[PDB]
Ligand binder design. Structure first.
Ligand code: ADP
Ligand code: ADP
Ligand code: ADP
Ligand code: ADP
Ligand code: CL
Ligand code: CL
Ligand code: CL
Ligand code: MG
Ligand code: MG
Ligand code: MG
Ligand code: MG
Lengths: 156, 155, 165, 165
């Protein structure tokens, strides 16, 4: 069972908070996007651009129950996995950390090289799923990673 | 433009010939799927799950259109991109290599009722690929390096 | 008693020919690199990054002396496990199949730049040939059976190994 | 010329700050790590792997000279451009803002992953303790301002730099 299951918007800090919290607890991180495109040997784009939302999410589900079931480390849920049904049932009992970041900063961490408008929708479609499965909310706007780690662990 | 543009089914080897034929030619492989989230800063999934499959096709198309005109090395086109009549229209004239592979082999080279599944997408696209290729190539028996020189001595 | 231990350089196909070879004898596969990632909790790149070869090798030995004792399937061995003399030693009298592979093919064949920390392409082909020099004497040494993968395709290599058992 | 040219250890914020800082000042970003990826059509990882460092440098210095000339935005300088004399000298006079970072935090923030081919494979910390020790003193002689990233976060650091330009 994962010691923590971190969820929240892209650029909430799933990997980054995860890599770090995994090192402090002494465990390994497992990313479900990594799990999926690993133990299918196709890229997530290969799956969407090839069999669609519906199959991918069913694939995502199945993979994330697996990792919920026998990853004993820290688990980062692929960002839209809390839409899938099977995935909200499965987090029931785990320790679930919701990383809150507001839409400006969420847009900023996500950079690379109107997009922010597509981010408010992602926010409005998921945020209240994130609260719905959350067993714990850490607001991350103003904290640095170490600080998000120590707030988390002190509640853990 | 692209010295080549690779199309095929999953397992054909767009990615693996893709890189190999780039390196082999002093240039870079671009990938249209890669180029979507390169250009829109948002992942392929967050597009589908946000704003429609069919909308994603209007995005892919526009990238493909720019990649075909902007990219001077090898292009690796995201399977799917060829349901879009614009993309079909936009390939016309470029070197397109259609890496052809069988169903069962196809299936084999994808990692550890699913042949039929791939049997359809075979059914679905095989015509579209065969119709836009300027160069077909049988990767079924051929080894990959060999594939690469095949194309290259036609480039 | 495992069925066949597939050894050789990176990109020789041990995990490829292994997955097929064991579908093909309806048996399970165990890939030690997948088992180490599975066991420890974290991936292979990281265990190198943080603890480096010796400690990885030490976890690798344990994971494989086990496989050689309780996997009855096909066991594809992580590239540098023959570098641990302990491993070389338990390998004796298993069927150690070695996928041989020139330099230029293996180089090219390792493209997802696979992950792969020893070949972490900081400057890649230099590194691979030098990992060929340390390792090819050691596979020749442990191997009961030696197989060109250059000019062959994964089917053929799965069948050729299928006759020789 | 560029409003600011950021330099720093891997991890210090060169690219990250570069985007936010250019939004803050309402001007362009030119990340040389990125301008190279575009110029050659291939990636950073992949250049180092195939052509070697001592050549990605020659590529790199080229894009850099271009930028100190053509660009008037925020410039995020490839982390090991300052190793090419030619660069250090074309950097004379430029407001070059040194991002400061712990080895211990530089290790942390580089540990997502993506590229970083000189940080590569086994023993990250020690590929890094070498790099710092062999790039930090160059940032020293070429920097005009310097700014501590450490416990401060990305937005206070754009405001730290903004309030001193
Ligand atoms: N708490 C934070 N403080 C500052 N930067 C952050 C913070 N968390 C993540 N970032 C940066 O945000 C970008 C997005 O981070 P990441 O955690 O990968 O998103 P995700 O939530 O999907 O894993 C990365 O550059 C990461 O370094
Ligand atoms: N001609 C070939 N012979 C043997 N294997 C091949 C050949 N072409 C591709 N492959 C293998 O197929 C696997 C999946 O291929 P990939 O290039 O992802 O296909 P795609 O472009 O269709 O996504 C790879 O491991 C690669 O080594
Ligand atoms: N005989 C072969 N012919 C063509 N491609 C191969 C062959 N064997 C392996 N490959 C391809 O090479 C890549 C790496 O193979 P892999 O199984 O990872 O080698 P290993 O596990 O021994 O390092 C895969 O993409 C596989 O598709
Ligand atoms: N002040 C900071 N607080 C937290 N995270 C940071 C900070 N500066 C950079 N990062 C994160 O560090 C990662 C590496 O930063 P990057 O900007 O690539 O470094 P460089 O460009 O110096 O190689 C990015 O995800 C960024 O999110
Ligand atoms: Cl996400
Ligand atoms: Cl290997
Ligand atoms: Cl750097
Ligand atoms: Mg992430
Ligand atoms: Mg592919
Ligand atoms: Mg392998
Ligand atoms: Mg940088």
């Amino acid at each position: 069972a994962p010691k923590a299951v971190l969820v929240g918007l892209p650029g909430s800090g799933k990997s980054t908070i995860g890599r770090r919290l995994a090192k402090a607890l002494g465990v390994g991180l497992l990313d479900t996007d990594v799990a999926i495109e690993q133990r299918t040997g196709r890229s997530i784009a290969d799956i969407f651009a090839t069999d669609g939302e519906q199959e991918f999410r069913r694939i995502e589900e199945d993979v994330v129950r697996a990792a919920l079931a026998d990853h004993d480390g820290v688990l980062s849920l692929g960002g839209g996995a809390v839409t899938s049904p099977g995935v909200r049932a499965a987090l029931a009992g785990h320790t679930v950390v919701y990383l809150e970041i507001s839409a400006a900063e969420g847009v900023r961490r996500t950079g690379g090289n109107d997009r922010a408008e597509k981010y408010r929708a992602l926010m409005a479609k998921r945020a209240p799923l994130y609260r719905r499965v959350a067993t714990m909310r850490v607001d991350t706007n103003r904290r640095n990673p170490g600080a998000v780690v120590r707030h988390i662990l002190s509640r853990l």
